[PDB]
Structure formats: structure tokens, C-alpha cells
């Protein structure tokens, strides 16, 4: 059997994780070091223990391999472009073996790496062959790197979860699992593949994974190590996991496997999958319910006031019928024919046979749609960077109606105006952009110095950026010499550094007109600042424009079978904006709108030059243009020469380039979406659609209503003459007049109408959101780099991003929670070996994952699986566990450990901090608060870290216009106030002196932190484990006074048999409860949620919720009005603008969540997709005057006190794993005015 | 108002062309076609 085949430590853990033994730190530690010590290939032996009955037979043609030498030609001078076999797009990877080009690594024999000799040739002398070999090894060991860890390890956790059956929890609606590991086609095809890699009884994995990349095993003579098998195992593992967290039927699962075995067998594994990526949502999600007899329940959502403030409201239940079926035809004819060419038709007829057995909209039907959509291979697809640029970036759009050259005026310097005669879609684009440019040019908003410092903060990216080259190898065109390091400089050309390099003349200088030399360097801060009036106008078109309340509510309303919905996705909206049509009308219109401004007004540091103006043939005359028009003359000299790309990929060896194209990797190809559809519904489609009925429908349709634009995506929802839509006459003739409308100016519209709704990759069928589990797979994670970046505790943040991202999805939790726990444990045994010294290690105890968000399986006093996966992370969850069993550990430590002599007011004389320290709670509490990334070493050239000149002069870019005085008035008037009078913080309130330090902390975050720093991380980590402070935190020790007891479940928010979310059916215990007790559509009252944050305009270096808390955190205390203006001057706001905020910030009319933010009680990301708005302020009492005690009566202080107490209640109410229920503060240990005073001691810090 | 008062005042020769030039163009074009013009008399604003 599988269970008695495992190692002693693992058998105990599998038992422990399953629920039989609450796991202790000894169970956790021995199971952690059992993984890292034993060889990784040994967990493939466990496949040989389970018997198998699935009829999946792998072909012997998997291991055949067309060699890489035919499929990796250096067509250009140093470009390893793969010569496609049969296509332009067959370039993902070749299904070759790396048999010859491997030399055995001496540490792990029979596991080789790139040949030492071959690598040298590529670096020194190109070997059309000696570099084509190197670009094949660094792709196949990078395509086998798109994975969270070793996938052989991720399979090893699934055998732990399937080692034992789960202990029955005791809940009524707890279904034991139906999945049998002896009946699974995924991990039977793994073992059938793994027979080929067998040298005398032992298994060799074909590619052990190292943070530099994969290490491929060297086959003995006669066998081939084909690179596709490692990806064929990475998908088959990811199917073996997604069919044990989904309860996928064995027959349905079998079809998915045959999809993979055909793909490994053909020439390219990666390529085959891509051509059949949409072959599985089309069979099921797109085509559900077309048979007669359709009819279940579906929600009845309303659009309240449609024009703006999309505020959908869940109002009722519809009863479906044979009418309002999906009018669109099924995808069986089209996808199956496409499917037919790869010889899997039989896997198409199986899924069609299953789908015809779900005729009506049930829980079982919409669970089936998630089962088929979890069959698409969610692995990422690495392609050579040089090769990728050729096939993606450079595709010039085809225009079926160009602007004639006699439709422009004469030139005015560089740009041209459009003539008034030429109507069409070009005229509406010109008129909607010129009218918006003549609103921006007459505006007081962008002349304020704080708005300038915000705009300079958007250019140096606080998040993102790319590998820009430099500036002074591009300023040899100019005369301006750039700044150099005063002291040793660490940051290399960081977007921030570019600002640092030239900050002498407001981050730009009309002496710096050499911004057009080498742009967009990616595999510029002065081109982002030349493009100021291009995204200033695009942020006026995008006035009407989050996912949780502006998309999730929508997708649902659009999917209901009243209104039929066309979803419009534009393919390559980047590569459709060209200067031949789109970007010349834009720069033409902005230069026309920018004349209603004062024609001598400089903008953003660019003066007001003159221009030729030759647009009249009888009188050309020099004309002074404005400052904003001067940027347009340099935008038109930049957009017309395209964008340079200095792509130099590290995958291919010598591949360096200089690439010009017309694609930008900001919000304009978002902004052009609405105005080009506004012309469709009003002018173009009523002009010709050849249908009397069709024309009638369009006339009553606008674009503010009936269209929701975002990015390149968008949903077009028709007027209410809806379900009654003739698909032959109306909805297909509306589509061909749409798809030919976009082709007359290059926009390749890709319409795919069906009665689901796709909106930025969140599908929903019939009022029920369907999560795509292959969008973020369990084993898969992109990296997009040769060498990765994994020190050691950067695996823990992956695990919490692996667990919580699977629970936004309605993945079954019990199979999932156990899997997450097993995976979490592996991520607790780490190490670091010095290059010239001793090796090191660390051991995170469990309870360091309970503090991070993973709920525990079995505490020592309970029954397993009663802590829900919606438990909030941190102190809200550490309270909501300790509030659960405080009646247990007090009774247990009264009959074990001796009583303490003094009294802890939360407990009694029963001594539980010496019991909590025995269970390892404090060692888990102080471990996760300890930092995880290695600190950049504190090394400078001079002044003991002071007088740094790259940090002190990034402030010069942020201090233009005597704003510098306001942040100096802020840090003076606050330090005069706080450190001597009262409210003495000791640390800085979030002022503007932190963010030039924050650009360096996000800039000096260099790779390879030296061995001096990561050893210092390992030593500091080991001290906070061995001597974790016995005392808890200062917030948690005050939260534990509250005794929260919860009553019977609250009146429901959804008739709990309409299925709202992809399988949160009674197979799932709590996910069906928390999605029907609470509702979806998370729009609530304006006294709870309504997105205030009473500052709004942050400087982008500051957290918005750090200002919003500390503006409230003073108002809780006895703050003088001076302490509000001194903090708000620290952000840089003017004294007049700070005063209007200093009077506003009252607890009366303050969002309930904001008050909770003061003491760091946040609504977490786990239930952001839930309607916890009315739950907190209706139910979850802070005082129910008959159950509660009069001792816990927050009297006068209740305005700010109640929010905290209502969020401690709902933290306990979502942590337990049943229906949500009314949670009452029973009593507080010590009175509530003796706790409200206790928080105000902490709120002075 | 400002749109239609442009369409009222835009000069156009086809009001002139229909009263003056097209009758001497129609009467020539009715003697060079193999089908002679078949006309019933136009009646304007007369019910009976």
C-alpha cells in the first residue's frame, strides 16, 4: 500500500495533516527534513505501490524526438530564430532530447548540465551550432522552470493527502471524497511514462530543478532524454492535483490526459497546446444549455442607475424555461473540427456526452463547467526573447480605409491638422480627442506644485519598470552630462536612477531635446515626461473608466438570460495604434485642442517655443505655440519614428538587437476603445445593417449605458428587447458589421458572442461566476528569467500566495487545505551554504503559517476541519482561534501546569502562556513578523551611511517649486509638537521624506545580496525562534480580553439553490455557506464601504492607508488641530488644502472600515469577494443588551469603539467553518472603558 | 438651431437645376431612349 511505503516521519505527518494527530513541532520538523534530505526521484517510487484500473495507455512515440539542430537555425546574424516546421508560430520549443550536450555534474552524477566546452564557444566564438545548442539548453531548462518548485515535490504532497482518508469532521454537510488514487488517469499516465526512466529498479527524474534552471539527467546509451516529458509530467501533475481538489470524475479527467499525450507526441509540446487552448472552454463553458428542457434558477440582478456608479443590486430569483435559452449556436461544430485534426475527436465526443447530461442550470451542471475548464494546460510557455519580439511586437496592422493624404492641412512644424471635410470614424476620433485636449489646456489642476510632484512620481514607477539601458550613452547626442556616484553606487539604471541622472532642470531641460535616440529599452523617464499631455488627455477620455465590486458584480449581471451579451475583445490593441492612422489623428487633435490655453504658457518645465506654421499656402508665418503643444511636436517626432527596443535576451547567448516598432508594452489603447464604439452604435451600424429590426434596436442604445470599456476588453450588453433576439437576422448581422467596422482602420475586433460573459478573464455563466483554475495553476508559476531568485524565506510568501489564490477560487477546501498544509511544511526547512565557510539553516515552526493566513487542521482540543479557509490573517485570525478554545486551554492548563502567582486578566490563575509556549504558539507568532528578504547591506563609501548623494538628490527631482518648504514645514512643526507636548510617536508620521528613501529601498534591492547579509538573516531568524518573546503582541494581548460568542445563522442573502459561484455546492461545506448566508454583489451602504480615503491624491511614495489611519489615529486621541496640519504638510499638501482635510476627519461620518484600520484590523483579501458590508452593521453586535454584560458597555467612546468590536466579532464568525452567524460581544475581561483607555495608550505608540 | 440655419443658408445649385436646367435635360433624354416616358399626371394636395 502507499501509506506503509512512506518514510517514518512522513507517515506520521500524513496522519497528522489528515487530522488524526494535531501536528506538533516535532511532527512538523521531522517531516520537513525528510523531504530535503532524501533524493527527489524517490517519491516517484510511490506510484509503483498503488494499483491502477484506468484505461489510459501512453504511446511509445512520446520518447521519439526530432533533433534540435534542424529546429534551431541562426537565420539572421546573431539571432537564434527557430526555423518553424510548418508555421510562423511554431517556435515555443522543439521536442528534441538533450542527449549529447550534457556533461555529468560531479556532485549529482548522471545529471548533466550544459556542456562546459559548448558554453565557451557561444560566449567567445559563435558556433551557429555552438550557440544554437546553448539557446536550446537555456530554453528547455527554462520551460522546465515555469513551476513553483520541483513538480516532483508537488506530486509528493498529493500522495500525502491521498495517503489516508480524511477524518470525518462531524458536520452534517460534510461529504467524504469520491476520488480514488487507484482510479485516476492523471497519475496513472505519470507512472506509465515513468517506466521509461528506469535504470535497474530505480527511477531517475528527467529534470531535477535548480534555482539557476533545470538539471537534465544523462541517459545511458540507447535511451533519449526528450525535453517534452518533463513538461508532460508538469501538466500531468497539475492535472492530478486539480482533479483531487475538484472531485473531477474519472471519465472526464481521462479525456484531459489524452489531450496531453497527443501534444507530447507531435513535434512541439508547447506549440500543440497553444493551438488547442480554447478547445476546452468551448466544448463546455461556451456551449452549455443549448438542448431543450433547459430550466433551473438564476439570479435577477438590476442595473440601478446605469450611466454611472455601476451599482448592481441582487434583487431576486428567476425561474428559467425553454425560452430565454442561449440563442448563440454551440461550439461543437467549430472546435471539434479544430480538435479533429490532432486525432482526439473521441475526447470531444466524451465531453459532449457529459454535457448533454446537464440539461438545466443546477449545482451539478455548473460544477461540470469548472471541471472541463480545469483541463486546459495552465503551464506557461517560454519562447526565445529574440524570437518572441519578431512574432509579437512587429505586426503592422492592415487598414482597409486609410486617410487620404489630401485630407490633412499643411504642416505646422511637425504635426498636421485634419480637414473639416473628412467625416468617418477618423473624424469622431479627432473630435473626441481635440475636445478633450481643449479641456485639459484650460484647467487649474496641473499648475499646483503638489500635482507636479504627483506627476513626477508616476514616471519613476513605484511598481514595475524595466531594464532601461542608461542615458549618457544616449546623451552623447546631447551635451548634458549626467550624475555619477559620490560614493559606491549600487542601483543600476533604475527608473529612479534615470530621474537621479538628470534632475537639474525639473527632471528635464529644453536643452534635453535628445529624448528621441533610444527609447523603450526592454527585452525612459524623459520620454514618459514628454508623454505628459498624451496620458493627461487619455485620463479625461477615461473619466467613466475594483474587480470585486465593478467586475464581479457585472460579469454576473451580463450573464443572466434576460439580456444577451456580446463581449468584445480586441486582439493586439498594442499593435494597432500606429502613426499611419491612429496616433496621427491623436497628436493632430491634441495640438489643435491645446490652443485654447494661453499660447505662451509653459507646461511642466517645457517652455513655449515658436513653430513654422505653413498650413496656409499664401501666408506661412512663425507662430508661438504653448508649452503643451511643444510636447506634441516632440511626440509626433517620436511616435512617427516608432519605438526603439534594445532587446538583449539572456536565454539566447549572443542575441543583442536594436528593434524599431510601433507598439508600447499606456492607457490610450484603453482610451480609444470607448470612442470607437461610440461611433459604431450611433453612426456606423445604423447606417447599414440591412435589417429593419436590427436598426431599431441600435437607435435606443448609447455607449455610456450598454457598453463597459476597460483595457482592450469590453462587454456590449444590448437594450431590453433582449432574449427575444433573432440570431440569424440580428445578432449575427450585427457582428459581421462590427468585425468589418474594425477592419477598416486596423482594429482586428475579435467577437465571440455566447450567453456567458468574459470580462478581463473572469468568466460567468448564467449569473454564476466560474473560476478558471488553469488561470493560476497549483504547480505552475512563471519566472521569465534564466536564473531565478529564491534565497530561502521567499518560498513562504509563495505558499500563502498559493493557498489564498486558490481559495478565491471555489476549490474544495478539505482536499486543498491539507495540500496547502503539506506544501507549507516543506517550505519550513531551508538552508544557505557559504562559499568559503559553514553552511546554515533555519526551521520555521508551525503557527508561523497560522499567523500568515493558513487555518489549522486540528488543534489539540477540537475536531478537525472546523476552522474555515476564510480565516483572516494575522491578529484578526490569531484572536479568532484563541477565542475559539479559550474555554479549553484554561481547563486544560488548570489540570496540568501549575498556576501562576499573579493574574493575567484575559485568563485567570490558570497559566496558559506557558502552555502556549509548549505548543509552539509564540515561536510561530514571532517568526512570521521577522523579515524574510535579505536587507541590502548597509555599506556606503563614506559618512557611516550619511551624505549619500544618490538618495539625497532623488529628492531634487521631487522638490521643484518650493514644495520643498512644505515638507520642511511639516517635519519641523510635527517634531516641535509631538516629541515634547503629547501624542509622542517616536517614529515618523508618513511624510514626504520617506519616499526618496523608499525609491532607494526599492532601488538598492539588488540581486545576490552578498553572503554577509543573508547569513545575517539566517542568524537573526534563528534567534527569534529559540527565544520568541513569551509575551504576545500589544494588540493581540488587548484583543483577547473580548469574549465573542456567536448565535444562530443570519437570514440568508440568496435562495441557496441558485448557483452563484462555480461549485460552492454542498460538496463544499463552508464555501456554500459563506456565499449564500452572505451574498455576492458586494455593494452595500455608504456609511460602511463607500470608497472615501479622505486625501485621495497621494504622492505615490506613501501608502494611502497609512495617512488615512494616522489622520484618524490622532482624532481618537486628544489631538490639537495643529497636529493635523503638521502631518498633512508633511505629505506636501498646502496649508489651505490641509485645513479643509483637518476639519473633515471626524469619527462621525467616517467609514467603519477606516476606523478598524486605525488598529490594523483590515478586511482581508479572503472575503473581499463577499458582501460583508451589511453583515457588520446589521448583525455582529458590539452590545446586545441582554446577552452581553453591562461591564462591556463602551459608553461615550462607542463611536470609534464599536467598529473595532464589530470586526473582532466578524473575524471570529468567518473563521469557524459553518454558516455565518450573528456574533455578539459577550463580555470583556476588564470593562470597555478600561480597554478603550488601553488602546489610547497604544495609539500614542 | 445653429446646425439647421447652416443647412438653410448653404448655397446650392440643384434648386436652380431642377426648375431651370433639368427640364431641358429631361426632354432631350426622353427622345433617345427605346422606351418613351410613360407618365400619369401629378396631382398635389387634391383628395378626389
Amino acid at each position: 500500500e502507499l501509506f506503509n511505503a512512506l518514510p517514518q516521519p512522513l507517515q506520521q505527518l500524513s496522519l497528522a495533516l489528515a487530522g488524526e494527530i494535531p501536528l506538533t513541532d516535532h511532527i512538523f520538523e521531522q517531516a520537513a527534513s525528510t523531504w530535503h534530505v532524501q533524493p527527489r526521484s524517490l517519491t516517484y517510487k510511490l506510484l509503483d505501490h498503488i494499483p491502477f484500473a484506468t484505461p489510459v495507455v501512453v504511446p511509445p512515440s512520446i520518447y521519439h524526438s526530432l533533433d534540435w539542430s534542424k529546429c534551431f537555425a541562426v537565420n539572421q546574424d546573431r539571432v537564434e530564430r527557430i526555423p518553424t516546421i510548418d508555421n510562423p508560430d511554431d517556435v515555443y520549443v522543439p521536442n528534441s532530447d538533450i542527449g549529447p550536450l550534457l556533461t555529468s555534474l560531479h556532485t549529482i552524477p548522471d545529471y548533466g548540465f550544459l556542456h562546459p566546452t559548448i558554453e565557451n564557444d557561444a560566449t567567445t566564438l559563435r558556433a551557429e551550432r555552438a550557440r544554437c545548442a546553448s539557446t536550446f539548453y537555456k530554453i528547455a531548462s527554462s520551460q522546465a522552470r515555469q513551476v513553483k518548485l520541483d513538480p516532483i515535490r508537488m506530486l509528493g504532497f498529493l500522495l500525502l493527502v491521498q495517503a489516508r482518508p480524511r477524518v470525518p469532521s462531524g458536520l452534517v454537510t460534510d461529504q467524504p471524497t469520491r476520488r480514488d488514487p487507484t482510479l485516476s488517469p492523471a497519475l496513472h499516465a505519470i507512472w506509465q511514462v515513468m517506466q521509461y526512466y528506469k535504470v535497474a529498479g530505480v527511477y531517475y527524474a528527467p529534470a531535477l530543478v535548480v534555482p539557476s534552471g533545470a538539471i537534465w539527467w544523462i541517459p545511458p546509451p540507447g535511451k533519449r532524454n526528450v525535453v517534452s516529458v518533463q513538461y508532460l509530467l508538469t501538466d500531468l501533475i497539475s492535472l492530478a492535483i486539480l482533479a483531487h481538489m475538484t472531485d473531477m470524475s474519472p471519465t472526464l479527467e481521462l479525456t484531459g490526459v489524452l489531450m496531453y499525450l497527443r501534444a507530447a507526441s507531435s513535434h512541439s509540446y508547447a506549440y500543440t497546446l497553444l493551438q488547442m487552448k480554447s478547445v476546452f472552454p468551448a466544448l463546455s463553458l461556451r456551449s452549455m444549455y443549448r438542448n431543450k428542457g433547459f430550466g433551473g434558477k438564476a439570479p435577477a440582478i438590476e442595473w440601478t442607475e446605469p450611466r454611472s456608479k455601476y451599482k448592481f443590486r441582487w434583487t431576486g430569483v428567476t425561474q428559467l424555461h425553454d425560452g430565454l435559452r442561449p440563442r448563440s449556436p454551440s461550439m461543437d461544430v467549430p472546435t471539434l473540427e479544430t480538435l479533429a485534426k490532432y486525432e482526439l475527436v473521441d475526447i470531444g465526443h466524451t465531453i459532449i456526452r457529459e454535457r448533454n447530461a446537464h440539461p438545466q442550470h443546477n449545482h451539478d451542471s455548473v460544477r461540470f463547467v469548472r471541471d472541463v475548464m480545469a483541463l486546459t494546460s495552465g503551464m506557461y510557455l517560454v519562447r526565445q526573447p529574440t524570437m518572441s519580439v519578431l512574432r509579437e511586437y512587429s505586426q503592422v496592422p492592415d487598414i482597409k480605409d486609410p486617410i487620404p493624404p489630401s485630407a490633412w492641412t499643411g504642416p505646422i512644424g511637425n504635426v498636421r491638422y485634419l480637414l473639416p471635410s473628412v467625416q468617418g470614424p477618423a473624424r469622431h476620433l479627432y473630435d473626441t480627442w481635440r475636445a478633450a485636449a481643449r479641456q485639459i489646456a484650460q484647467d487649474p489642476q496641473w499648475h499646483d506644485p503638489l500635482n507636479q510632484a504627483i506627476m513626477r512620481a508616476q514616471y519613476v514607477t513605484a511598481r514595475g519598470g524595466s531594464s532601461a539601458s542608461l542615458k549618457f550613452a544616449l546623451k552623447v547626442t546631447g551635451i548634458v552630462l549626467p550624475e555619477y556616484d559620490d560614493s559606491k553606487v549600487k542601483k543600476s539604471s533604475k527608473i529612479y536612477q534615470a530621474a537621479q541622472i538628470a534632475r537639474i532642470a525639473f527632471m528635464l531641460l529644453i536643452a534635453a531635446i535628445h529624448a528621441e535616440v533610444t527609447m523603450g529599452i526592454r527585452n525612459n523617464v524623459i520620454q514618459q515626461a514628454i508623454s505628459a499631455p498624451h496620458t493627461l488627455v487619455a485620463n479625461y477620455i477615461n473619466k467613466h473608466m475594483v474587480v470585486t465590486d465593478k467586475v464581479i458584480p457585472l460579469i454576473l449581471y451580463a450573464s443572466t438570460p434576460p439580456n444577451t451579451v456580446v463581449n468584445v475583445d480586441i486582439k493586439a490593441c498594442d499593435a494597432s495604434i500606429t502613426y499611419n492612422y491612429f496616433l496621427s489623428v491623436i497628436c493632430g487633435a491634441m495640438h489643435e485642442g491645446f490652443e485654447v490655453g494661453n499660447a505662451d504658457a509653459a507646461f511642466m518645465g517645457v517652455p513655449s517655443t515658436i513653430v513654422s506654421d505653413r498650413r496656409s499656402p499664401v501666408a506661412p508665418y512663425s507662430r508661438p505655440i504653448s508649452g503643451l503643444q511643444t510636447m506634441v511636436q516632440h511626440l509626433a517626432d517620436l511616435y512617427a519614428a516608432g519605438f526603439r527596443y534594445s532587446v538583449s535576451d539572456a536565454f539566447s547567448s549572443g542575441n543583442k538587437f536594436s528593434f524599431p516598432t510601433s507598439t508600447f508594452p499606456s492607457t490610450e489603447h484603453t482610451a480609444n476603445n470607448s470612442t470607437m464604439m461610440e461611433y459604431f452604435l450611433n453612426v456606423h451600424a445604423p447606417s447599414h445593417v440591412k435589417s429593419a429590426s436590427l436598426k431599431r434596436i441600435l437607435t435606443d442604445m448609447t455607449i455610456q449605458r450598454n457598453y463597459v470599456c476597460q483595457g482592450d476588453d469590453g462587454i456590449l450588453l444590448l437594450p431590453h428587447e433582449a432574449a427575444s433576439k433573432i440570431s440569424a437576422d440580428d445578432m449575427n448581422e450585427l457582428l459581421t458589421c462590427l468585425r468589418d467596422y474594425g477592419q477598416l482602420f486596423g482594429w482586428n475586433y475579435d467577437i465571440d458572442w455566447s450567453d456567458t460573459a468574459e470580462y478581463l478573464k473572469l468568466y460567468a455563466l448564467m449569473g454564476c461566476r466560474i473560476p478558471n483554475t488553469s488561470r493560476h495553476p497549483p504547480v505552475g508559476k512563471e519566472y521569465a528569467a534564466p536564473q531565478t531568485d529564491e534565497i530561502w524565506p521567499s518560498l513562504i510568501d509563495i505558499v500563502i500566495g498559493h493557498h489564498l489564490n486558490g481559495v478565491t477560487d471555489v476549490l474544495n477546501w478539505r482536499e486543498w487545505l491539507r495540500f496547502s498544509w503539506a506544501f507549507a511544511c516543506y517550505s519550513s526547512r531551508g538552508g544557505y551554504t557559504n562559499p568559503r565557510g559553514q553552511s546554515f539553516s533555519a526551521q520555521y515552526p508551525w503557527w508561523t503559517f497560522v499567523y500568515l493566513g493558513i487555518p489549522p487542521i486540528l488543534l489539540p482540543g477540537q475536531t478537525p476541519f472546523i476552522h474555515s479557509c476564510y480565516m483572516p490573517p494575522g491578529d484578526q485570525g490569531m484572536f479568532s482561534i484563541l477565542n475559539g478554545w479559550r474555554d479549553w486551554l484554561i481547563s486544560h492548563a488548570s489540570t496540568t501546569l501549575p498556576p501562576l502567582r499573579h493574574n493575567h486578566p484575559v485568563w485567570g490563575l490558570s497559566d496558559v502562556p506557558s502552555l502556549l509556549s509548549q505548543f509552539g504558539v509564540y515561536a510561530g507568532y514571532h517568526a512570521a513578523q521577522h523579515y524574510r528578504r535579505p536587507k541590502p547591506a548597509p555599506e556606503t563609501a563614506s559618512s557611516d551611511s550619511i551624505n549619500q548623494i544618490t538618495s539625497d538628490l532623488t529628492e531634487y527631482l521631487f522638490y521643484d517649486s518650493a514644495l520643498k518648504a512644505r515638507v520642511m514645514k511639516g517635519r519641523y512643526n510635527w517634531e516641535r509638537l509631538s516629541s515634547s507636548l503629547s501624542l509622542n510617536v517616536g517614529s515618523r508620521v508618513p511624510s514626504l521624506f520617506d519616499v526618496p528613501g523608499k525609491w532607494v529601498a526599492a532601488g538598492r534591492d539588488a540581486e545576490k545580496p552578498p553572503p554577509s547579509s543573508v547569513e545575517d538573516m539566517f542568524t537573526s531568524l534563528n534567534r527569534c525562534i529559540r527565544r520568541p518573546t513569551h509575551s504576545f503582541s500589544r494588540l493581540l494581548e488587548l484583543y483577547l480580553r473580548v469574549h465573542v460568542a456567536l448565535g444562530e445563522s443570519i437570514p440568508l442573502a440568496i435562495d441557496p439553490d441558485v448557483p452563484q459561484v462555480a461549485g460552492a455546492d454542498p460538496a463544499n461545506d463552508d464555501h456554500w455557506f459563506k456565499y449564500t448566508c452572505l451574498g455576492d454583489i458586494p455593494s452595500a451602504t455608504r456609511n460602511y464601504f463607500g470608497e472615501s480615503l479622505f486625501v485621495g491624491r497621494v504622492v505615490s511614495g506613501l501608502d494611502v492607508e497609512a495617512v488615512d489611519a494616522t489622520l484618524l489615529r490622532l482624532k481618537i486621541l486628544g489631538a490639537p488641530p495643529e497636529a493635523f496640519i503638521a502631518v498633512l504638510n508633511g505629505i506636501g499638501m498646502s496649508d489651505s488644502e490641509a485645513h479643509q482635510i483637518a476639519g473633515r476627519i471626524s469619527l462621525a461620518n467616517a467609514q467603519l472600515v477606516q476606523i478598524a484600520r486605525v488598529v490594523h484590523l483590515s478586511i482581508p483579501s479572503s472575503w473581499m469577494t463577499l458582501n460583508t458590508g451589511p453583515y457588520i452593521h446589521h448583525h455582529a453586535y458590539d452590545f446586545k443588551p441582554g446577552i452581553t454584560q453591562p461591564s462591556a458597555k463602551s459608553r461615550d467612546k462607542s463611536i470609534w469603539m464599536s467598529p473595532i468590536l464589530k470586526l473582532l466579532c466578524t473575524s471570529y464568525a468567518m473563521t469557524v467553518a459553518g454558516p455565518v452567524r450573528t456574533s455578539i460581544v459577550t463580555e470583556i475581561d476588564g470593562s470597555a472603558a478600561a480597554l478603550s483607555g488601553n488602546l489610547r495608550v497604544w495609539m500614542r505608540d | 438651431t445653429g446646425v439647421m440655419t447652416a443647412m438653410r443658408q448653404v448655397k446650392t445649385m440643384t434648386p436652380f437645376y431642377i426648375q431651370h436646367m433639368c427640364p431641358t435635360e429631361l426632354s432631350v433624354l426622353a427622345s433617345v431612349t427605346v422606351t418613351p416616358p410613360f407618365q400619369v399626371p401629378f396631382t398635389r394636395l387634391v383628395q378626389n
Partner: peptide, 27 residues
């Protein structure tokens, strides 16, 4: 000669015609 460039210049400051030659030939 029919050409809307007289009309479109005047009407866009405030923002083969076979159906004309058929209703003349129908007279």
C-alpha cells in the same frame, strides 16, 4: 456635380448619389 464639401465645412463648425438620380428618372 454633387459634393458635400460646401455643406460639411459649414455643418462641422457646430458639432454616386443614386437615390437622387433615381427619383428624377422616376418623374
Amino acid at each position: 456635380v454633387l459634393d458635400p464639401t460646401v455643406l460639411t465645412n459649414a455643418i462641422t463648425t457646430i458639432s454616386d448619389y443614386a437615390a437622387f438620380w433615381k427619383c428624377i428618372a422616376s418623374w
